[PDB]
Amino acid sequence: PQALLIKVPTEIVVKVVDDVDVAAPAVGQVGKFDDELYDEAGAQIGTSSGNFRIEYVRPTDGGLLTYFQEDITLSDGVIHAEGWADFNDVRTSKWVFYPATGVSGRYLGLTGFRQWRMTGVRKSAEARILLGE
Amino acid sequence: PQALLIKVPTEIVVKVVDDVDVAAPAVGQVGKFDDELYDEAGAQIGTSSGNFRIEYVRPTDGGLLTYFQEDITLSDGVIHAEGWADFNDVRTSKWVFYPATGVSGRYLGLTGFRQWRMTGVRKSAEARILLGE
Secondary structure, eight states: OEEEEEEEEEEEEEEEOEEEEEEEEEETTTEEOOOEEETSSOOOOEEEEEEEEEEOOOOOTEEEEEEEEEEEEETTTTEEEEEEHHHHHHTTOOOOEEEEEEEEEEEOOOOEEEEEEESSTTTEEEEEEEEEE | EEEEEEEEEEEEEEEEEOOOSSOOOOTTTEEEEEEEETTTSSOOOEEEEEEEEEEEOOOOTTEEEEEEEEEEEEEEEEEEEEEEEEHHHHHHHOEEEEEEEEOGGGGOOOEEEEEEEEOTTTEEEEEEEEEEE
């Protein structure tokens, strides 16, 4: 279109394999995730599969700067997303984001941002994908 | 509309005061800028005023991670934007981005991202603002 916002009020982590030290996350820890994405009516709209690696400690604030990559498969196309987030935000239920690129279907040509936040709820996040032409 | 894309084909730097070493930008350097934003027909659509500070070197790529803060005044509202960008990308004409928050007028309550790229033409850039409800 010109601009598209996909709201993902619930994103469930259906599989996570990682070596992240709970409470004490550190450089070199990695994770793989498979998620299911649901719209405002509770209908599954897609899945995502991605991974991450904690890469470095940001000296300004002690952030654990982590590099995420994922492919988000929706019913009418696929969106790649990758970039940086502070794992200290991840684990304190603060929003993180990184660039997103539509790679097929409806989303080809569109670019923007993938955003998500882990919520109070076990293995659950909320997310948003904002794209434009 | 639940999402909006504002395309800014030309953004001109009208005033800049900095101590950025053009040959070897470095940590601790700062700048202040004032810009003019133009639409596809060459009409001024707004201004931006902001500042930056080069904060640290990222080990993964030697990036000069820089913190930007600005207020973008458009004819129908104001958008705040701030966050991280690699000054090595700024100086090589690659896109940078950081979160944006509408703070008045048409943009009140909207949130998204500010994006810009120096074109390699004398202190001109191109930009995008992508916002969602």
